[PDB]
Recover the amino acids of this structure.
């Protein structure tokens, strides 16, 4: 724009300073060659020449001193203006003392060439300024030449050399733009990539422990990088011995959370959960998951600890301090049971949707029943606990109320797009080149040889075929046929770039050798004119800045150096030192210069490639990280939480089902190395249920979490819009249709299974519910309500292979067109009796 | 670290899953491996093969509704002896018991019943056994390697072996083939190298011990169909063994049992012309083995999609040279599939 492009050249200051300093080196090189030509050869009659070049030299080293100064920031382009005005006074002052007999078109014109392109390359003037300075210097310099036959060709030289000059100018600073832009976006997307890498790192470290995370941190197996985007799916489980298990839960949880406004229960429940998280992080713990009212931890399955069980039981005494100190904070009438067992556990992660690091063993279930066999105030600890437990506590009988258990209480500017301009511009300037080569004849009407017209013919036909081929290759007509572009650029690789570039470069020198064969000094005006002609047209060769420096500069040296020296030697008396000395500064000039431009072009391509790669890596980082955010938490709770910290949401009517695999216990048998092949089967099944939800119409269902072998999902949350085509009970009905669907899916799963069947039972309820978020840096989205307890106690007691319906669901689904039958009225805790209906008939 | 070298030697091994129908000879093949390329229970379980055998025949005589009575009924105290020890897990094997099974083996209802024990459930290696028990009343001479290979043992539960053949790693599983054990077969579906399948040849007039109602051969066809179309088995080629060649050969020499009277696919069947014979060969034997070969290969025609193949070879459990030859060919083919991907 304005300010940032200004700061660009504020930091592109030292390199323009650098090339400008060696332009000053070229200026002292120029005063050096004036010093030798007026030093050894001739003009030993007046020594007027040497002093402005000598003060021009103390301008050179003196402004090399002045390059370092600090009154210089708003001065250095104006310092170039001072420099080129001393140039102008030097050449315009030293030109005129002629017309006595000797100095020809070649001398003063060569001066003007070196001055003009030393200006238009490096001196870093603006558009307007270098423009009118070059043009004004041209016209007053050529009328210094004078004091309608050949002067017309002089003006053709001047206007063509201006047009190629402004061409070089505009391409120079547009590369100066685009290089800076690519580098700037390259320095934004790298640090954005690093910060969002830290955000993804937070999402990994909010769901899982450190070990499997650090396997995901360095692509150690690319099965996981292939698992971000047939035989068996991969999943991590390790079967580890000598760990311990702590379960804790509130007794009598039925009525105690009645009058909560769904934030007060969040307040005390998440307050006690915050104190839980405090004592876990202070007591070196492995917390797992909140199962409604039950909270639980284990003892060091990544890190097997030396006094691990003591950490577990004194940790649970920490939970005794939690219930006494937070209860007598709030002055409640509540309590909690604790059951702790030492044993072996196979741990890991199943599933591929909403998954979570969980644990599995019958030792875990032993802890579950010790909570079921629990009692308040003291920790319920097994045989395998107390068999090695240092006896430093108060051990008591955990006896039956009706298995050997104790209690403890305490103690623009594109590449071929620019090649359009250097070729097309190169052939319009070639047009006025050969036009000027012939219509110098105003005292004649035709060039003598016909081979000149042959070079005109094949030259203009080759440049026009390159013209039409390139321009219809670019501007995308696609009317007749484009396969000849593919089949002819199919052989035009990076080396035919060199070669056809050498063709279009090398032919205009033969076109100024349209006047080369026979006589050219009957009039010497033809001779001096054709010398000035070929030294004019030789400057053309830089326009392909996109080929190499030794190659184009050497080829340019060949075609621009052969017949000049060689045609000086056949015979007009003394011109050689000055004419081919200025050929020498011409040649080192063109070598150094196009060398510089092709290096600049290569650096532009570099600075585009690297920014492209970093852009790709931040694209992959956003897909993987936001894929985890779409994994762990739901969508509009990400809309509420995404820019904030809290969440609590009432809900009034919603549907919820349980699914219960029955016979997984009898299928379990663990005579093998952990038996975890059976968990590979189970994980293939749960993964198939994961694939059931990726339908677009069945993207309206939200899976809650996995609970052992009990599956869980709900709906009535995705309709966050008051749409005009959304039925108030549609997700209920289609959720039932999905329930019969997944009945058919488990039927097909036992169809692949051999000689065996898995049974299951499902239970339904609609009603009001509670949307909530629990954790702090280790989170979980969860729902609550009496409704989930109703469907919970339903499908807990439900008969297999059938669909379990509530009486109110019986009231609604028939009028959505479904047949049922009355089963009875089964006892429901909290409800007394509740009237039961079933779907299969 | 050492995860990469251990995981690469984990790649470089040769795990062999050995499924197959019930009591086929899979454990016999594993015994053949430990005789080729590798201490008191043998007396026990061989003599319990003896006991369960002789009481299964002697009890099973009156169970045959074609009335099979004793041609020598004068050993009724030996009959009642076998009815006395009929259900007892403990026995001391006196020489008098050897006189009991000896003198039973002198009777011809035992021998024609051995010609007809396929009519019910009974072992198929007792003609070895009663001759050996005629010799091995004492066992001061330790019984041989053929004695090891005839030793019937019920097989269930995953047993593993890691033996090496000329810088070739062997870790393989014997798996049971009874119906209730079939819930355990997916335990070894974890990406094993090769799957080798074995069916007893003579099981075209016998039934399984589950129902005693349907032929073991059609049981084998059902099993091959149930594995052959799975969504977990499509990436492993199967090498198909057909064990118990010679028992089928002596039932051909019997000429009493016909598959075509049971399975009339064999009735209008003709012999295959792409054969590769055996020396001194009855063409009905050839049409038999090529018939059953075409029966399983006909099921292999129905699928595969060039993914999982079917390689029918042949073997019997009494040849060292056959296990040598076709198992070296197995090593060649599992070298190809071991470097398939
Ligand atoms: C009015 N209903 C509620 C309002 C707000 C928060 C919770 C409830 C509620 O109904 O809580 C019940 C379960 O939904 C809720 N709930 C408990 N575990 C789960 C669980 O694991 N999953 C789900 N979806 N809900 C659960 O706990 C309570 C019953 O726990 P249990 O039947 O497992 O026996 P307990 O754990 O010993 O409690 P108690 O016998 O001492 O009374
Ligand atoms: N004559 C003869 N007997 C055989 C042959 N193959 C196996 N047997 C006998 O059959 C008996 C049962 O074989 P066995 O190895 O136990 O079958 P299995 O398949 O491994 O047993 P399971 O896993 O199905 S329960 C063995 O005692 C063996 O001696 C054979 O080819 N010829
Ligand atoms: C699902 C497999 C198996 C055998 C493994 C297991 O240890 C359990 O998942 C635990 C203890 C275990 O997963 C901890 C969570 C939870 C839910 C409390 C389980 C149930 O009690 C399961 O029993 C029920 C009721 O499904 C149970 C016992 O089932
Ligand atoms: Mg076996
Ligand atoms: Mn409770
Ligand atoms: Mn609970």
């Amino acid at each position: 724009s304005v300010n940032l492009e200004e700061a660009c050249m504020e930091r592109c200051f030292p390199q323009t300073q650098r090339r400008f300093r060696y332009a000053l080196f070229y200026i002292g090189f120029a005063c050096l060659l004036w010093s030798i030509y007026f030093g050894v050869h001739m003009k030993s009659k007046l020594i007027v020449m040497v002093a402005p070049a000598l003060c021009f030299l103390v301008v050179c080293v003196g402004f090399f001193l002045f390059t370092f100064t600090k009154l210089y920031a708003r001065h250095y382009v104006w310092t170039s203006l001072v420099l080129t005005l001393l140039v102008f006074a030097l050449t315009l002052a030293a030109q005129f003392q002629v017309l006595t007999p000797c100095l020809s078109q070649v001398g003063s014109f060569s001066m003007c060439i070196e001055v003009l392109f030393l200006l238009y390359t490096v001196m870093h003037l603006p558009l307007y300024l270098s423009l009118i300075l070059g043009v004004a210097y041209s016209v007053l310099f050529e009328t210094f030449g004078y004091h309608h036959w050949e002067l017309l060709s002089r003006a053709l030289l001047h206007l063509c050399i201006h047009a190629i000059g402004i061409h070089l100018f505009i391409m120079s600073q547009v590369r100066s733009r685009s290089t800076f832009l690519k580098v700037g976006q390259s320095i934004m997307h790298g640090k954005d990539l690093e910060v969002e890498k830290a955000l993804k790192e937070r999402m990994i470290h909010s769901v899982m422990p450190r070990i499997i995370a650090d396997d995901l941190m360095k692509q150690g197996d690319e099965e996981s990088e292939n698992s971000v985007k047939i035989a068996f799916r991969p999943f991590k489980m390790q079967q580890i011995e000598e760990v311990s298990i702590l379960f804790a839960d509130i007794v009598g949880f039925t009525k105690m959370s009645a009058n909560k406004s769904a934030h007060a229960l969040v307040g005390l429940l998440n307050d006690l959960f915050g104190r839980f998280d405090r004592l876990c992080e202070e007591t070196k713990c492995e917390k797992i998951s909140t199962l409604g009212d039950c909270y639980y931890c284990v003892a060091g399955c990544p890190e097997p600890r030396a006094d691990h069980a003591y950490c577990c039981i004194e940790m649970g005494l920490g939970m005794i301090r939690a219930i006494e100190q937070f209860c007598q904070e709030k002055k409640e009438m509540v309590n909690m049971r604790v059951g702790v067992h030492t044993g072996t556990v196979l741990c890991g992660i199943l599933g591929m949707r909403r998954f979570k690091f969980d644990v599995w063993s019958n030792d875990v279930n032993l802890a579950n029943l010790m909570e079921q066999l629990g009692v308040a105030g003291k920790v319920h600890i097994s045989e395998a606990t107390a068999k090695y437990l240092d006896d430093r506590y108060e051990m008591e009988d955990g006896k039956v109320t009706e298995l050997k258990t104790y209690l403890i209480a305490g103690q623009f500017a594109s590449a071929t797009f620019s090649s359009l301009l250097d070729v097309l511009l190169s052939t319009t300037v070639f047009l006025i080149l050969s036009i000027t080569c012939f219509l110098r004849y105003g005292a004649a009407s035709t060039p003598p040889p016909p081979a000149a017209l042959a070079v005109f013919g094949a030259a203009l036909l080759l440049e026009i075929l390159s013209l039409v081929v390139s321009v219809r290759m670019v501007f995308f007509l696609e009317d007749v046929m484009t396969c000849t572009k593919r089949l002819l650029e199919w052989i035009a690789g990076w080396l035919p770039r060199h070669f056809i570039g050498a063709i279009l470069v090398s032919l205009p020198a033969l076109a100024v050798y349209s006047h080369v064969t026979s006589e050219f000094e009957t009039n010497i005006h033809s001779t001096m004119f054709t010398g000035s002609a070929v030294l004019t047209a030789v400057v053309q060769y830089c326009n392909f800045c996109q080929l190499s420096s030794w190659m184009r500069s050497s080829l340019a040296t060949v075609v621009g150096a052969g017949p000049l020296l060689l045609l000086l030697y056949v015979s007009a008396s003394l011109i050689g030192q000055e004419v081919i000395l200025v050929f020498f500064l011409l040649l080192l000039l063109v070598w150094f210069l196009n060398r510089e431009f092709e290096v600049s072009y290569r650096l532009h391509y570099h600075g585009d490639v690297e920014a492209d790669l970093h852009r790709t890596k931040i694209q992959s980082m956003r897909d993987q990280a936001d894929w985890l955010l779409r994994n762990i938490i739901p969508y509009h709770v990400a809309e509420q939480l995404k820019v904030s910290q809290t969440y609590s949401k009432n809900h009034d009517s919603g549907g919820v089902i349980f699914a219960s695999i029955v016979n997984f216990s009898e299928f379990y048998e663990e005579n093998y190395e952990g038996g975890k092949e059976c968990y590979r089967v189970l994980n293939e099944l749960i993964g198939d249920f994961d694939e059931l939800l990726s339908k677009p119409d069945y993207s309206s269902i939200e899976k809650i979490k996995t609970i052992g072998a009990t599956y869980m999902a709900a709906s009535g949350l995705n309709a966050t819009q008051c749409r005009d085509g959304s039925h108030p009970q549609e997700h209920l009905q289609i959720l039932f249709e999905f329930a019969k669907e997944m009945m058919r899916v488990v039927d097909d799963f036992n169809n692949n299974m051999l000689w065996f069947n898995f049974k299951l039972r499902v239970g339904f309820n609609h009603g009001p519910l509670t949307a909530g978020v629990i954790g702090t840096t280790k989170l979980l989205y969860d729902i609550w309500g009496d409704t989930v307890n109703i469907a919970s106690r339903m499908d807990t007691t439900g008969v297999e292979c059938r669909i379990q319906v509530s009486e109110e669901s019986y009231r609604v689904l028939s009028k959505m067109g479904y047949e049922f039958d009355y089963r009875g009225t089964v006892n429901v805790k909290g409800k007394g009796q509740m009237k039961t209906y079933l779907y299969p008939k | 670290k050492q995860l990469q070298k251990d995981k690469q030697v984990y790649r470089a091994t040769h795990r062999l899953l050995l499924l197959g129908a019930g009591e086929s000879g899979k454990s016999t093949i594993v015994k053949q491996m430990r005789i080729l390329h590798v201490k008191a229970t043998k007396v026990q379980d061989i003599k319990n093969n003896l006991k369960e055998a002789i009481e299964t025949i002697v009890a099973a005589m009156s169970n045959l509704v074609p009335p099979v009575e004793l041609a020598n009924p004068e050993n009724q105290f030996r009959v009642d002896y076998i009815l006395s020890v009929m259900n007892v897990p403990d026995f001391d094997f006196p020489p008098e018991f050897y006189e009991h099974a000896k003198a039973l083996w002198e009777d011809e209802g035992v021998r024609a019943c051995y010609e007809r024990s396929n009519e019910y459930q009974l072992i198929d290696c007792a003609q070895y056994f009663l001759d050996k028990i005629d010799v091995i009343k004492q066992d001061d001479y330790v019984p041989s390697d053929q004695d090891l290979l005839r030793c019937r043992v019920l097989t269930s539960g995953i047993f593993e072996t890691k033996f090496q053949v000329d810088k070739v790693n062997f870790h393989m599983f014997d798996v049971g083939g009874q119906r209730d054990e079939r819930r355990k077969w997916i335990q070894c579906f974890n990406d094993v190298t090769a799957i080798i399948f074995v069916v007893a040849s003579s099981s075209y007039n016998m039934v399984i011990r589950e129902d005693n109602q349907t032929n073991r051969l059609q049981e084998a066809l059902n099993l091959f169909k149930s594995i052959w179309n799975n969504r977990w088995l499509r990436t492993i080629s199967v090498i198909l063994f057909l064990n118990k060649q010679d028992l089928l050969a002596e039932k051909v020499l019997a000429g009493k049992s016909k598959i075509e009277d049971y399975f009339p696919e064999f009735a209008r069947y003709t012999t295959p012309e792409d054969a590769t014979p055996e020396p001194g060969e009855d063409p009905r034997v050839t049409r038999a083995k090529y018939f059953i070969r075409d029966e399983f290969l006909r099921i292999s025609t129905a699928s595969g999609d060039g993914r999982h193949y079917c390689y029918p070879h042949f073997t019997c459990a009494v040849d060292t040279e056959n296990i040598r030859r076709v198992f070296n060919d197995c090593r060649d083919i599992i070298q190809r599939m071991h470097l398939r991907q």
Q: What stands out?
A: Strands of chain B lie at 15-18, 159-164, 169-174, 194-200, 238-243, 310-312. Chain B has two domains: 4-37+165-335, 41-149. Chain B touches chain A at residues 3, 157-158, 179, 182-191, 226-227, 230-232, 234-235 (CB under 8 Å). The first helix of chain B runs from residue 4 to 11.
